[PDB]
Enzyme design. Sequence first.
Site, short mmCIF file in Angstrom:
data_model
loop_
_atom_site.label_atom_id
_atom_site.label_comp_id
_atom_site.label_asym_id
_atom_site.label_seq_id
_atom_site.Cartn_x
_atom_site.Cartn_y
_atom_site.Cartn_z
N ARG A 42 0.84 -1.19 0.00
CA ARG A 42 0.00 0.00 0.00
C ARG A 42 0.88 1.24 0.00
O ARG A 42 1.80 1.35 0.81
CB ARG A 42 -0.93 0.01 1.21
CG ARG A 42 -2.21 0.80 1.02
CD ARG A 42 -3.37 0.14 1.75
NE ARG A 42 -4.30 1.12 2.31
CZ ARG A 42 -4.04 1.89 3.37
NH1 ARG A 42 -2.87 1.78 3.99
NH2 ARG A 42 -4.94 2.75 3.81
N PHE B 19 1.77 10.63 2.48
CA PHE B 19 1.30 10.01 3.71
C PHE B 19 2.28 8.93 4.17
O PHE B 19 3.05 9.16 5.10
CB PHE B 19 -0.11 9.44 3.50
CG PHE B 19 -0.71 8.77 4.71
CD1 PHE B 19 -0.22 9.01 5.99
CD2 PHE B 19 -1.78 7.91 4.57
CE1 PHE B 19 -0.77 8.37 7.09
CE2 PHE B 19 -2.35 7.28 5.67
CZ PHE B 19 -1.84 7.51 6.93
N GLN C 6 3.45 1.18 3.09
CA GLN C 6 3.14 0.12 4.04
C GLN C 6 3.60 -1.22 3.50
O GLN C 6 3.29 -1.57 2.36
CB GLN C 6 1.64 0.09 4.34
CG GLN C 6 1.25 -0.83 5.48
CD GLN C 6 -0.24 -0.82 5.73
OE1 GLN C 6 -0.98 -0.03 5.15
NE2 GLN C 6 -0.69 -1.71 6.61
N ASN D 15 -1.56 -1.79 12.94
CA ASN D 15 -2.29 -2.64 13.88
C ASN D 15 -3.77 -2.61 13.53
O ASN D 15 -4.22 -1.84 12.67
CB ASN D 15 -2.06 -2.21 15.33
CG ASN D 15 -2.49 -0.77 15.61
OD1 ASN D 15 -3.60 -0.36 15.27
ND2 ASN D 15 -1.60 0.00 16.24
N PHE E 95 4.67 0.83 8.65
CA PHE E 95 4.69 1.83 7.60
C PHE E 95 5.83 2.82 7.86
O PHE E 95 6.34 2.94 8.97
CB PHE E 95 3.36 2.59 7.45
CG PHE E 95 2.62 2.81 8.73
CD1 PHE E 95 1.71 1.88 9.19
CD2 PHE E 95 2.77 3.99 9.43
CE1 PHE E 95 1.00 2.09 10.35
CE2 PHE E 95 2.07 4.22 10.60
CZ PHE E 95 1.18 3.26 11.06
N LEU F 234 -2.23 9.60 13.67
CA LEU F 234 -1.80 8.29 14.13
C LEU F 234 -1.16 8.34 15.52
O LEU F 234 -0.96 7.28 16.12
CB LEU F 234 -0.81 7.67 13.14
CG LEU F 234 -1.27 7.49 11.69
CD1 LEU F 234 -0.10 7.08 10.81
CD2 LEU F 234 -2.38 6.46 11.61
N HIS G 76 -0.13 4.23 17.48
CA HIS G 76 0.81 3.36 16.80
C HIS G 76 2.20 3.54 17.40
O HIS G 76 2.60 4.66 17.72
CB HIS G 76 0.83 3.64 15.29
CG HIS G 76 -0.49 3.41 14.62
ND1 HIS G 76 -0.85 2.18 14.11
CD2 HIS G 76 -1.53 4.24 14.39
CE1 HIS G 76 -2.07 2.27 13.59
NE2 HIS G 76 -2.50 3.50 13.75
#
Length: 166
Positions: A57, A62, A65, A103, A114, A123, A127
């Site tokens: 991804r 951003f 991943q 997660n 990521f 986030l 995370h």
Amino acid sequence: EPEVTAKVYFDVMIDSEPLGRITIGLFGKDAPLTTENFRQLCTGEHGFGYKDSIFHRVIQNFMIQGGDFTNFDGTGGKSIYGEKFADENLNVKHFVGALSMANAGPNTNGSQFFITTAPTPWLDGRHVVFGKVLDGMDVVLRMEKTKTNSHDRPVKPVKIVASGEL
């Protein structure tokens, strides 16, 4: 900044195209269990890990991943401790170049991670930030510009052809 206690690397390729080496430093003092899981997945001492896995991804401006070396679509992955392990440190803020565990809620860390490319404050606190890109950020920015067809999946596989400890 947290202290770097170890260094691991990814060698990245995108379909007959070497992109270069991404060097990653781990915050072994602020997240010992998380860095050890990541470090030993980089080397592969337990028979599995990040070698020959992909970044499934990519969201421009951003994050990228990866880490799903069992299902290659974001649904799989596993830790060296078993299935999932607990959230360690949640007070570290994300930043450009940070390594963070994906997660599915609290205490569901597996192997998916990521690398943030922009500020991602939404986030923070949820995370576990456990490392940062020490070198090869331009490789990360190059991977971020790859063509995504649907579901933010790269149309050509972004492959980790080699990983380990430095």
